[PDB]
UniProtKB/TrEMBL annotation, chain E:
<protein>
    <submittedName>
        <fullName>Uncharacterized protein</fullName>
    </submittedName>
</protein>
<feature type="binding site">
    <location>
        <position position="57"/>
    </location>
    <ligand>
        <name>acetyl-CoA</name>
    </ligand>
</feature>
From TrEMBL, chain F:
<protein>
    <submittedName>
        <fullName>Uncharacterized protein</fullName>
    </submittedName>
</protein>
<dbReference type="GO" id="GO:0005763">
    <property type="term" value="C:mitochondrial small ribosomal subunit"/>
</dbReference>
From TrEMBL, chain H:
<protein>
    <submittedName>
        <fullName>Uncharacterized protein</fullName>
    </submittedName>
</protein>
UniProtKB/TrEMBL annotation, chain J:
<protein>
    <submittedName>
        <fullName>Uncharacterized protein</fullName>
    </submittedName>
</protein>
Length: 170, 212, 180, 203, 413, 226, 124, 162, 50, 89, 108
RNA sequence: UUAGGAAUAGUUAAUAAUAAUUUAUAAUUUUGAUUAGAUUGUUUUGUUAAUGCUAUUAGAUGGGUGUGGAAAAAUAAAAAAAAUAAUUAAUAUAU
């Protein structure tokens, strides 16, 4: 239970504050119609930090797709057909929210990933083991079904017939 | 009414020992000498040995050795049937054995019957196949059993199987074997290679000629 | 869960078990015997300075003369009196919120007070036990069963809360024209 | 499951008599389906040709509630209740009916009773549930008396100082021991209330 | 008083069994010193013990270990020419002389360091021994007999120990091997002789020891030890390539959980070895790993082994970083004694679900720790992971060095 | 808990039941899981009054002087078989005398078909040990038409009291795999003329009149008199 | 009559008839000369029969007499065997394991000799 | 009798039952007090000494390798290739059982557990010649409050201190 | 019952603790998820009276 | 205590108890009848349990908000008096 | 695979990882091939035990018939392969967009 | 707490150290230690004008079994112990 916090702080300080961009990245998918296959678009939205590189954006797309049919092979990020250098920052390309980013796949390969980083990893190192969701998707406050409501069963000083003092100093 | 808190935890579900109060006080030096002198009394060990602290019975390696080292009760087999009984006990009566016998192996024990003492060794192997090993007999098992009882001239054991066959395990008995032992027929088989009715005391009456 | 079990007081599910409302006695003669309705554990704590959870009251099993008969004569006033004191709120807290156990003698004593129905062991020996058959029970259930929403609102009033505000009170709780 | 539920309700409402096969093939073994699937499917079971097919399909739906850990809702049991004269499928347990009859007859004779309609303060409410009483009963005393050497009592005692004479105190203890602590032995004035509950109880 | 005092009291030293008994008693003395239970023993300067020794009640806590080390020194000065005679058929084999030298070095590394004013002897005796002659005598007796080093695991530990004795005591390791494989060379180093004659390790820990001895045996010679390529990418020396390929063997680093028993300090050795191999042969790696196909069957095996070792090392770094003190981040000892299994085997289970000594056996195994990254580990791994990449890569966008830096700042705050 | 009797109800300790949960109440004792058990005292103790006047022989005693007459040996084998059969029929004693070791046939306990109880086991595999009256049996459990997806171990397969009816159409050879019998709701369509449910959830059997008469005579409602 | 320490059937002469048995309370049972456990058993059996429960319980005398012969302290239906001072044959004076006479047990029995004589008679 | 009590526990601890059974057989024949009732039979009557087997093994050859093996008389050896493979089975099985530690012993035999020894002088006794190594008497020999009443000193300063 | 979500806030003030904003947020969201809107307004009035 | 009637299944065993717990179907049926007659009482018991629980919670609610109102008035007056004394000091 | 297109469940050959990366990448991976072609550097052990073959009863009856179950153990004894050979056609209806529609043994 | 008052130690802190091969000018004590003696404590008792003197009987228990959630386990008039055994009353025990 050592979560590196032994007091009560109701506010959030600067090391947990991140500056994020809602980057949405398109994928070329194929759906079956009565005629045959039709090419459509599947969009995966991530919150990437502003000073991140494009390889980090690709890793964020890999860890936040939650679909077994999208990240099936090694893909590459591109804008208007021109491929992107994965060792460059998003600010070097002027990538904004309205910039259309596509993911071109090579289905002959097989993407072998090893998810050792948890999905909700912040600086304070508090991770859930059964999280199964991006932290931007989950709600802030929800009902706790794992705990159990417990009332006070041990009286301190008052036990019976007449409340004279109640042994309040104890 | 459980012995969970009266004896140690390794004696959980423990039944069938001689006395489980022995193995709670083994570590005392007057009883620890008694345990090591008992292993020398049982033999099979070249060094002084004590059984483990959390074991009441003998270990599986030690009880296998004393079962293998144990001399057989039948020493000096005269007949090749009695040599097959000693091979039966090394194969189908080993310590913690897994393999079951075969109805063809019962036919091998029934084909070596020479003297009337061999039939008592053979029919007791037939009882282990039905009761102990629970083996369904073959279709020709009563055929080998019938001719085994006729070499030693023992007909009263052959007709004893007809009045109750399914307690003995003979699920197929052909009608000519039933007519022979009950007295309806006077022969039980027709030889394909000699063309005569067995036994040979009936062949002198029925078939006066020799045919291929 | 001991090697040699305490032969005189066996219990269930180890110590300290569920809290139980008992009527404990004193080590005196019967002529001065009184009972304490207490809340304790299933196994009695003899290694503590806190030997009980809560003290619900005292029952006197000896009948007293009615010393208040010329105050206001009502029906059956000049009979004898059985004096008992009962902590109502602590009993309801340990009964509903904490879900204590009950012995049959405190159950009968609290059924005399109107807090509980009469116990299971208080047998009318002239009336035998009922005999159930599912066909007559189904016929009575299909003869008159309540509505679903009416039964749900009855359970909501009995179990969840009983002070639900009317529309005339919601019209009074809302603010007025300087803020509305 | 809510996507398959609309398909099952559409196949029931169109009267195609094939919603049960879709529920078996797609929703039964591989989904955590709730009880309104069978509330939809009971109307499709009702439209069968013979009554025995209706009966066996309803009983098989009850066995499906038993096996796949999906308990039957109140609406489904009330739907099977209304056709008990035709199907004779029992939809309540042996325990709930014996509770229901003994509760309903007692509540009817209790509502018809004119004597026991009076309120009972022992039964109707809880008078007080706070750990401390709402008004001062005078106690504690917070002073010693004759024959008492231990003052303050320490653990589990409300006495704070000796009754008559004390070693010299400073600060808030000096103001407390002489003026501001409790004193129930004062015959003229009770121990005081906080502000502003002393002005309106001056007389 | 040691038992070796009764063997040097005027006996016939030319006898073989007397030399064997001297060696066995000195081995027993050094092993009793090394395996001494030092739980209650304490060494603090007490003023009342100035003009005397320690107290009679405080003999076993204060005087015993210091007297044991001084007896070890005073018997080493009398014994070291009997077990290890000067170089001119022998009385002792090379293996038992190696065992005696190993226990002597283990007693010398853990000598008593604190010098009290009570001690009448010199403080220089509270320093470790110089065993430069004995390693040369053991190497001369080990190159005399063939097949001293075998592909067995015990011979792998003996190879690690002999290379350790040659690194610590300034002895060339090529003396442990015959001169015909050192013929044709003007000078060879210790680490080159390690990387040229290393056997294939069956565990990851033996490979970690070999990769540590390679780095420590060549401090400034770490460039010449592991350079097997030119400045254009062509392989210069295939002997170093065959040594470095069989260091990172498939029996050691082949499994997905091959680094399950690697601590935070051994992972630094693994990443330092990978970074040194990448830095010394950068023209080979940046040519061959990107878009180059090679026909040499050894180079593809070396490249696959290096990629596998670097990937499992980065996976172990992410294991120790992102899951601190986790049950999947716990380590254990190789061939470690887990006594619950041996207690279940040598008991009679009438019901196999009832496991005896369960509350103690499930807690206890041979050394098993919850592993998290400290300050000295994280500050070194943040350098080594950045060393694993190329110079043209941006260290800002690396998502593992930044996580290590933020972990350092969060655990320091 | 997972499954309490009558929910939480603690006016008496008998209202909770004789067992508080179908799961084991402690983790260290998995054998305390709630399951259907079998009266092994009456069943495992066979009648020794059929072995009287019959000379049995030990296994190790193969010396010549301890051998018996072959007619006495045959009546000893008949008496030992009658001793093994005297209480009931085992699974391993019924499957040995069947084709393909009885694979695919339906085995059932005596009380598995009376009342409103309907349950059998379609046999899938049996591993006989050297003592052929014991072993380990496997099968698909069928309870009121519904069937398991995988073969489960048949509990109390060594205790006698089992029955089967041999059907040649259900026999599966050793080359093939015994298929699971179909669930009557899921796999095959539901037909009331083929299989009709004896019991269902929220159903209880009607009261027999002899049990009603016996309870009203025991309670004293009906005038029981000698 | 179920318990050993409640000899209920020993007081048949202490009652006149059925009504005398079912009208006597515990004070009248104390007057008639019945011990405390026996009169408690009689009164509880009468009160159970009045409530609709006839005295149909298993007599636990012989089961408790079986469990009495062991050295359990709390009479908790366990089996605790007694351990004597000598539990091994070697400390009872027996020097070694008994050797069976392999020449005497491998002789042919008398029925086998009679059958061999019958075979020699019928073969010739 | 104190020497026989110590020497029996040392031979039991060091896994020597032949030397311990011969010690009980010797003390019963010599008339040592406390051991006239304990007399053990010699189960090693036909077996030779343990040192004589190791001398014979260094230098009938089928019986030379199996001279250490103890038989009941109703047991027979295996063939020499089969018995030698069985003797290595028991060799690796005995050391496998003796290498497992008992979890609550602190690495001690049961003889070592609760075996604290001080001479007879530590508990209200002085020199006697026949008590060579006399264990100090237990604390139940002298109870307090039977030698002196309550709130009164007793002349036993170091009695109950072990 | 959902009324306990109103109870454990009240016992927070009887036991002389200052309820933080997260406690009011949790109480109002737990009472809104159970459909108790008047109890959520009671939590808001409790926050205003503090 | 579980009743062992005489007409249960007897265990003919000299190594344990002489009567098992295996019933008769009539015993099963009458035990079910007694179970239902206890189930009525335990239904009323649990009903009164939940009724008393919600009664205690409602009473705690009302008394708690009254105490909160009075204590807020008291602490406001106390803080004002403390601020005046601090100004004088 | 008979109702939806699974991406990498059906290949044209065995996946060719190097011999050093064989133990690291292969466990946890599944793919279907056409015909009974076994990978090299394995020892073929056919499962003939009826106690071990009984658990494919629902697989062989309601889906494609199980012909042979083989366990492949390599030279280093560290990477198993459970090879099950089915015989078509499927008893389940196969979608045209499914993965098993691209298999000749499943479509015929 | 001792009518005749002096030394004590499996020892103190640090620690990448579970399971301490290291470091230190270490720790307790004349403001009364350790040991030895007496020794359950406790505004519950008694007395008196008495903040004085004088009494006490709730309890716990590192080698008996690593079982059990917890050793408290070799014996206790109830603490009723998994089907309403009995719940009218008094003796409730001798019996
Ligand atoms: Mg240090």
């Amino acid at each position: 239970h050592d979560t590196d916090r032994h007091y009560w702080r109701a506010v959030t300080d600067d090391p947990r504050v991140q500056h994020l961009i809602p980057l949405r990245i398109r994928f070329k998918i194929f759906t079956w119609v009565t005629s045959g296959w039709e090419q459509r678009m599947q969009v995966v939205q991530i919150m990437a930090p502003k000073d991140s590189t494009i390889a980090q954006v690709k890793d964020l797309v890999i860890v936040e797709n939650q679909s077994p049919y999208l990240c099936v092979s090694s893909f590459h990020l591109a804008i208007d057909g021109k491929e992107l250098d994965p060792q460059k920052t998003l600010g070097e390309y002027g990538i904004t929210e309205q910039s259309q980013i596509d993911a071109i796949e090579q289905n002959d390969h097989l993407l072998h990933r090893d998810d050792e980083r948890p999905r909700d990893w912040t600086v304070d190192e508090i991770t859930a083991e059964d999280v199964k969701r991006s932290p931007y998707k989950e709600m802030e406050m929800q009902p706790l079904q794992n705990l159990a409501p417990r009332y006070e069963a041990r009286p301190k000083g008052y036990f019976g017939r007449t409340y004279y003092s109640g042994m309040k100093q104890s | 009414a459980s012995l969970r808190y009266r004896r140690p935890y390794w004696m959980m579900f423990l039944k069938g020992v001689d006395n489980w109060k022995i193995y709670t006080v083994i570590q005392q030096p007057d009883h620890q000498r008694t345990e090591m002198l008992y292993q020398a009394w049982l033999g099979g060990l070249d060094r002084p040995y004590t059984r483990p602290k959390c074991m009441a019975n003998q270990p599986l390696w030690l009880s296998k050795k004393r079962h293998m080292l144990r001399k057989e009760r039948l020493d000096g087999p005269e007949t090749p049937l009695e040599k097959y009984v000693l091979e039966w006990h090394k194969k189908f009566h080993s310590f913690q054995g897994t393999e079951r016998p075969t109805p063809d192996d019962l036919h091998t024990a029934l084909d070596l019957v020479e003297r009337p003492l061999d039939l008592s060794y053979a029919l007791q192997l037939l009882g282990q196949c039905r009761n102990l090993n629970n083996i369904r007999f073959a279709k020709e098992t009563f055929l080998v059993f019938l001719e085994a009882c006729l070499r030693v001239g023992r007909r009263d054991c052959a007709e004893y199987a007809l009045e109750h066959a399914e307690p003995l395990g003979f699920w197929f008995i052909d009608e000519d074997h039933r007519r022979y032992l009950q007295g309806e027929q006077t022969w039980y088989k027709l030889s394909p290679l000699d063309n005569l009715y067995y036994p040979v005391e009936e062949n002198a009456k029925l078939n006066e000629g020799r045919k291929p | 869960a001991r090697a040699v079990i305490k032969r005189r007081s066996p219990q269930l599910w180890g110590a300290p078990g569920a809290p139980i409302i008992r009527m404990r006695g004193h080590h005196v003669v019967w002529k001065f015997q009184s009972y304490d309705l207490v809340v304790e554990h299933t196994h009695k704590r003899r290694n503590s300075d806190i030997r009980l959870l809560h003290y619900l009251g005292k029952h006197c099993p000896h009948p007293q003369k009615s010393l208040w008969s010329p105050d206001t004569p009502v029906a059956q006033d000049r009979h004898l009196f059985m004096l008992t004191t009962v902590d109502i709120d602590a009993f309801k807290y340990w009964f509903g919120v904490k879900r204590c156990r009950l012995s049959m003698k405190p159950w009968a004593l609290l059924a005399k007070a109107g807090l509980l129905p009469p116990s299971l062991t208080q047998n009318s020996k002239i009336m035998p036990k009922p005999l159930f058959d599912k066909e007559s029970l189904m016929r009575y259930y299909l003869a008159n069963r309540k509505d679903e929403d009416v039964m749900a609102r009855e359970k909501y009033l009995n179990y969840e809360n009983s002070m639900v505000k009317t529309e005339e009170e919601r019209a009074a709780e809302r603010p007025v024209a300087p803020y509305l | 499951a809510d996507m398959h539920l609309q398909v099952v309700e559409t196949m029931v409402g169109c009267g195609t008599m094939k919603a049960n096969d879709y529920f078996v093939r797609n929703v039964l073994r591989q989904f955590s389906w709730d009880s309104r699937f069978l509330e939809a499917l009971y109307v499709e079971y009702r439209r069968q040709d013979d009554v025995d097919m209706w009966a066996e399909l309803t009983k098989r739906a009850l066995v499906w509630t038993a096996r796949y850990n999906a308990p039957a809702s109140e609406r489904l049991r009330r739907l099977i209740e209304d056709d008990y004269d035709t199907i004779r499928v029992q939809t309540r347990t042996f325990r709930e009916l014996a509770v229901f009859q003994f509760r309903d007859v007692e509540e009817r004779r209790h509502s018809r009773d004119v004597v026991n309609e009076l309120p009972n303060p022992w039964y109707d409410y809880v008078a007080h549930a706070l750990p401390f009483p709402d008004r001062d009963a005078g106690y504690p005393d917070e002073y010693g008396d004759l024959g008492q050497w231990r003052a303050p009592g320490g653990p589990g005692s409300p006495v704070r100082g000796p009754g008559y004479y004390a070693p010299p105190m400073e600060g808030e203890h000096q103001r407390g021991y002489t003026a501001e602590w409790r004193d129930l032995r004062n015959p003229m004035r009770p121990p005081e209330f906080p502000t502003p509950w002393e002005r309106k109880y001056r007389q | 008083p040691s038992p070796v005092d009764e063997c040097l009291r005027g006996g016939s030293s030319l006898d073989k069994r007397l030399i064997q008994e001297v060696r066995e008693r000195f081995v027993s003395f050094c092993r009793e010193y090394v395996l001494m239970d030092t739980s209650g023993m304490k060494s603090t300067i007490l003023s009342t013990e100035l003009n005397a020794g320690p107290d009679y009640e405080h003999y076993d806590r204060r005087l015993r270990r210091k007297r044991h080390w001084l007896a070890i020194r005073h018997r080493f000065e009398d014994v070291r020419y009997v077990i290890w005679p000067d170089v001119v058929n022998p009385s002792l084999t090379a293996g038992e002389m190696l065992e005696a030298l190993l226990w002597l070095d283990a007693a010398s590394t853990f000598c008593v360091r604190k010098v009290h004013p009570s001690d009448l002897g010199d403080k220089s005796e509270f320093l470790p021994l110089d065993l430069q002659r004995e390693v040369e005598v053991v190497a001369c007796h080990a190159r005399r007999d063939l097949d001293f080093f075998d592909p067995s695991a015990t011979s792998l530990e003996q190879f690690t120990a002999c290379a350790a004795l040659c690194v610590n005591h300034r002895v060339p390791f090529s003396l442990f091997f015959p001169a015909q494989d050192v013929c044709g060379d003007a000078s060879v180093s210790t680490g080159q002789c390690i990387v040229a004659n290393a056997p294939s390790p069956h565990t990851a820990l033996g490979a970690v020891r070999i990769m540590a001895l390679i780095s420590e045996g060549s401090g400034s010679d770490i460039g010449k030890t592991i350079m097997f390529s030119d400045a254009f990418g062509a392989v210069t020396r295939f002997g170093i390539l065959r040594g470095l390929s069989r260091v990172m063997s498939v029996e050691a680093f082949g499994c997905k959980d091959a680094l399950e028993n690697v601590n935070e300090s051994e992972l630094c050795i693994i990443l330092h070895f990978c970074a040194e191999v990448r830095e010394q042969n950068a023209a080979f790696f940046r040519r061959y790993e990107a878009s180059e196909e090679d026909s040499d069957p050894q180079q593809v095996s070396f490249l696959a082994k290096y990629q596998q070792l670097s990937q499992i090392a980065l996976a172990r770094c992410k294991r120790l970083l992102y899951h601190p003190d986790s049950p999947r981040a716990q380590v254990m000892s190789e061939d470690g004694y887990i006594p619950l299994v041996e207690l279940q085997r040598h008991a009679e289970g009438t019901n196999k679900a009832a496991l005896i000594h369960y509350n103690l056996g499930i807690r206890s195994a041979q050394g098993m720790r919850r592993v998290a990254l400290g300050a000295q580990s994280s500050a070194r791994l943040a350098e080594l992971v950045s060393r694993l990449e190329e110079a043209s890569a941006r260290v800002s966008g690396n998502t593992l060095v930044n996580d290590l830096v933020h972990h350092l700042s969060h655990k320091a705050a | 808990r997972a499954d309490p009797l009558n929910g939480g109800s603690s006016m008496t300790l008998g209202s909770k039941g004789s067992k508080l949960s179908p799961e084991p109440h402690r983790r260290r004792m998995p054998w305390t899981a709630a399951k259907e058990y079998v009266p092994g005292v009456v069943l495992n103790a066979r009648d020794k009054m059929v072995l009287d006047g019959v000379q049995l022989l030990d296994i190790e005693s193969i010396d010549r002087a301890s051998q018996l007459d072959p007619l006495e040996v045959l009546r000893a084998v008949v008496a030992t078989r009658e001793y093994n059969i005297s209480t009931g029929k085992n699974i391993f004693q019924l499957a040995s005398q069947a084709t393909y070791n009885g694979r695919g046939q339906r085995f059932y306990r005596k009380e598995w078909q009376e009342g409103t109880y309907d349950k059998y086991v379609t046999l899938s595999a049996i591993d006989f040990d050297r003592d052929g009256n014991k072993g380990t049996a496997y099968g698909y459990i069928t309870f009121h038409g519904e069937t398991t997806t995988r073969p489960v171990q048949v509990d109390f397969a060594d205790v006698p009291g089992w029955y089967m009816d041999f059907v040649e159409e259900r026999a599966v050879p050793f080359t093939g795999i015994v298929p699971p019998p179909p669930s009557i709701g899921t796999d095959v369509p539901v037909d009331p003329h083929s299989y009709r449910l004896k019991a269902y959830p929220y159903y209880d059997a009607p009261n027999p009149p002899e049990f009603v008469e016996r309870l009203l005579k025991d309670r004293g409602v009906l005038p029981d008199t000698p | 009559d179920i318990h050993r320490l409640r000899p209920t059937s020993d007081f048949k002469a202490s009652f006149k008839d059925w009504n005398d048995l079912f009208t006597c309370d515990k004070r009248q049972l104390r007057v008639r000369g019945i011990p405390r456990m026996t009169r408690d058993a009689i009164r509880t059996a009468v009160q159970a029969f009045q409530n609709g429960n006839p005295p149909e319980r298993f007599d636990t005398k012989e089961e408790w007499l079986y469990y009495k012969q062991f050295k359990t302290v709390d009479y908790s239906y366990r089996v605790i065997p007694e351990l004597p001072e000598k539990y091994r044959p070697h400390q009872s004076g027996i020097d070694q394991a008994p050797l069976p006479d392999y020449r005497e047990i491998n002789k042919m029995p008398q029925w086998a000799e009679c059958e061999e004589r019958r075979q020699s008679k019928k073969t010739v | 009798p104190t020497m026989v009590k110590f020497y029996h526990d040392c031979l039991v601890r060091n896994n020597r039952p032949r030397e311990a059974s011969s010690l009980m057989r010797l003390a019963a024949e010599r008339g040592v007090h406390g051991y006239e009732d304990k007399w053990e039979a010699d189960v090693y009557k036909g077996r030779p000494l343990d040192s004589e087997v190791m001398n014979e093994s260094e230098g009938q050859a089928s019986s030379l390798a199996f001279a250490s093996l103890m038989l009941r008389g109703d047991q027979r050896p295996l063939p020499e290739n089969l018995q030698a493979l069985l003797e290595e089975e028991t060799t690796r099985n005995i050391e496998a059982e003796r290498s497992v530690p008992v979890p609550f012993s602190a690495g001690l035999h049961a003889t070592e557990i609760n075996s604290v020894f001080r001479p007879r002088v530590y508990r209200q006794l002085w020199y006697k010649w026949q008590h060579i190594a006399n264990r100090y008497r237990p604390t139940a020999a002298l109870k307090r409050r039977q030698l002196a009443p309550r709130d009164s000193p007793t002349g036993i300063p170091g009695f109950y201190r072990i | 019952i959902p009324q306990e979500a109103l109870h454990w806030l009240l016992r927070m003030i009887v036991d002389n603790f200052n309820p933080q904003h997260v406690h009011y947020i949790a109480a109002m969201k737990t009472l809104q998820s159970a459909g108790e809107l008047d109890m959520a307004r009671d939590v808001w009035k409790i926050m205003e009276r503090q | 205590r579980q009743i062992r009637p005489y007409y249960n299944l007897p265990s003919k065993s000299e190594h344990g108890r002489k009567m098992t717990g295996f019933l008769t179907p009539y015993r099963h049926w009458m035990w079910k009848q007694n179970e239902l007659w206890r189930n009525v009482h335990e239904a009323q018991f649990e009903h009164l349990r939940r009724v008393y629980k919600r009664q205690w919670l409602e009473s705690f609610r009302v008394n708690a908000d009254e105490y909160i109102y009075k204590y807020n008035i008291t602490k406001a007056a106390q803080l004002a008096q403390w601020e005046c004394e601090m100004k004088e000091q | 695979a008979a109702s939806s297109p699974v991406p990498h469940i059906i290949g044209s050959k065995h996946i060719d990882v190097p011999r050093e990366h064989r133990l690291r990448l292969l466990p946890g991976m599944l793919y279907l091939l056409d015909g009974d072609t076994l990978p090299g550097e394995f020892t073929i052990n056919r499962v003939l035990d009826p106690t071990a073959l009984q658990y494919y009863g629902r697989l062989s009856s309601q889906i494609v018939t199980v012909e042979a179950v083989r366990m492949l153990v390599p030279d280093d004894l560290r990477l198993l392969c459970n090879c099950i050979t089915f015989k078509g056609p499927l008893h389940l209806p196969v979608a045209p967009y499914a993965s098993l529609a691209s298999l000749r043994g499943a479509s015929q």
